[PDB]
Amino acid sequence: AADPVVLMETAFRKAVKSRQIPGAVIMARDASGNLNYTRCFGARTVRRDENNQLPPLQVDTPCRLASATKLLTTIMALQCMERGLVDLDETVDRLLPDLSAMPVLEGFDDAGNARLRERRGKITLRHLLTHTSGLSYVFLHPLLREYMAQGHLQSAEKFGIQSRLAPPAVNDPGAEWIYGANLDWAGKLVERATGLDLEQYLQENICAPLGITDMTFKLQQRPDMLARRADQTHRNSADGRLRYDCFGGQGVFSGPGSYMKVLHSLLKRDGLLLQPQTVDLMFQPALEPRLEEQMNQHMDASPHINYGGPMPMVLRRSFGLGGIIALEDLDGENWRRKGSLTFGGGPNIVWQIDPKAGLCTLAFFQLEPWNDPVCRDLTRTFEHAIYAQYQQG
């Protein structure tokens, strides 16, 4: 093992032992197939089992991907796009009339009543995949905040409208980049285009092709793996110490080893689940120029959120179909290169595909909250290390 890679590995092992993290599964791969690094650290929980030892996590251990599910759904949409069932620029309302029926919430008046408007513009699958549907998540936007305060979301029950799909848009399509629920609609679009719920579609069009068996939405229906799942860990603000704790877009449980397989096929054009042309698209910076600027501005101004994760807080980025795209070079030839596409999920799960560097890496944790200092620091120095040993050794 390389000078950086051994220092890195023991630096993880240090963090597990000094109770800073519970554990981590980390993984790197290259376009050749040939690079195959995969190392497990620590325990899958902090809560001791019946025998006073804590079972260790490993590549087959079931873990909540959480907000890292989105890529999978982003894939499943582009599968249908390929197969002719939809088209990126087709107005959603063919398959999602109920979405196209939703109004946009403009603002509030003085009596405080909800002020509401119909949508200028129209709304496409490309918009959804790029978080440019002009719709948002409830507790991130100040308007929806109060819409929620008034209790205008209560009424969805009457029309059988799913909780997550209920909130109104807060802008027109193509207007802003806004991290939003627009990946559960993506989930719907598929279900409706393929007459299949996305649990069935997932196994058929993603798991089967790569021979996966630990990927599922319905974990409660898998005694075999439910029993061995990873418990969630949460870190306290006071101490720094840690304590115990079917829509697309979030809520898949998978082994970290299997998630890699997916990142791999993509990296290496292998064509097993998607089609190299349409993969290239995912990596094409979708954001219009004035759009990509406001996104950068927003993301810089919100460091408490840190969509970037391990990568420099100030950076020039855009967005593609599945994640963020580093528009400039992260640190010369030492680290990620212009073109690389990263995203990640709640429990400090962070993946990235770098085509120009011929690599794809996946750091896998089960610790909340997002953007943890030790996780970020370890992820930082994880990538730094395998990038170095690999490409210059």
- The answer to whether residues 249 and 181 touch, using CB atoms and an 8 Å cutoff, is yes
Which segments are annotated as binding site for 2-methylbutanoate?
346
- The answer to whether residues 262 and 273 touch, using CB atoms and an 8 Å cutoff, is yes
Reported residue count of the chain is 393
To the query of whether residue 67 is one of the catalytic residues in this protein, the response is yes
For residue 287 the two structure tokens come to 């954001």
- The answer to whether residues 105 and 144 touch, using CB atoms and an 8 Å cutoff, is yes
Other beta carbons within 10 Å of 88? 18
Which segments are annotated as binding site for monacolin J?
64, 164, 179, 368, 370
- The answer to whether residues 70 and 307 touch, using CB atoms and an 8 Å cutoff, is no
**369 upstream amide cis, omega within 30 of 0:** yes
Question: Which of 381, 373, 374, 371 lies closest to 307 in space, CA to CA?
Answer: 371
Question: Which of 37, 74, 55 lies closest to 185 in space, CA to CA?
Answer: 74
Burial class (CB in 10 A: 0-12, 13-18, 19+), 373: exposed
Residue 292 to residue 319: CA distance in whole angstroms: 8
Question: Which of 238, 272, 291, 346 lies closest to 127 in space, CA to CA?
Answer: 291
Please report, to the nearest 10 degrees, the dihedral formed by the alpha carbons of residues 234, 181, 71, 349 taken in order.
Answer: -10
**Contacts for 332 with CB less than 8 Å, ≥ 6 apart:** none
Q: In whole angstroms, how far apart are CA 249 and each of 71, 155, 203, 276, 347?
A: 8, 23, 16, 23, 15
Q: DSSP of 363-384, one letter per residue?
A: EE--EESSS-HHHHHHHHHHHH
User: Which value in Å is the resolution of this experimental model?
Assistant: 3.4
Which segments are annotated as binding site?
64, 164, 179, 346, 368, 370
Task: State the greatest distance between any 2 C-alpha atoms of the chain, in Å, as a whole number.
Answer: 68
**Contacts for 17 with CB less than 8 Å, ≥ 6 apart:** none
Residue 97 to residue 130: CA distance in whole angstroms: 20
Residue at 57: amino acid letter: L
**Contacts for 293 with CB less than 8 Å, ≥ 6 apart:** none
Residue 65 to residue 86: CA distance in whole angstroms: 27
Breaks in the chain, after residue numbers (C to N greater than 2.5 Å): 245
Burial class (CB in 10 A: 0-12, 13-18, 19+), 127: buried
Pairing state of beta strands 114-117 and 233-235?
unpaired
For residue 143 the two structure tokens come to 């308007």
Pairing state of beta strands 23-30 and 349-354?
unpaired
Q: Which method was it determined by?
A: X-ray
- Among the listed residues 18, 32, 67, 318, the single catalytic one is 67
For residue 251 the two structure tokens come to 């809520």
Burial class (CB in 10 A: 0-12, 13-18, 19+), 175: middle
- The answer to whether residues 88 and 125 touch, using CB atoms and an 8 Å cutoff, is yes
- The answer to whether residues 153 and 166 touch, using CB atoms and an 8 Å cutoff, is yes
Domains along the chain? 1-393 (3.40.710.10)
Q: Which helix (H) or strand (E) holds 261?
A: helix 256-267
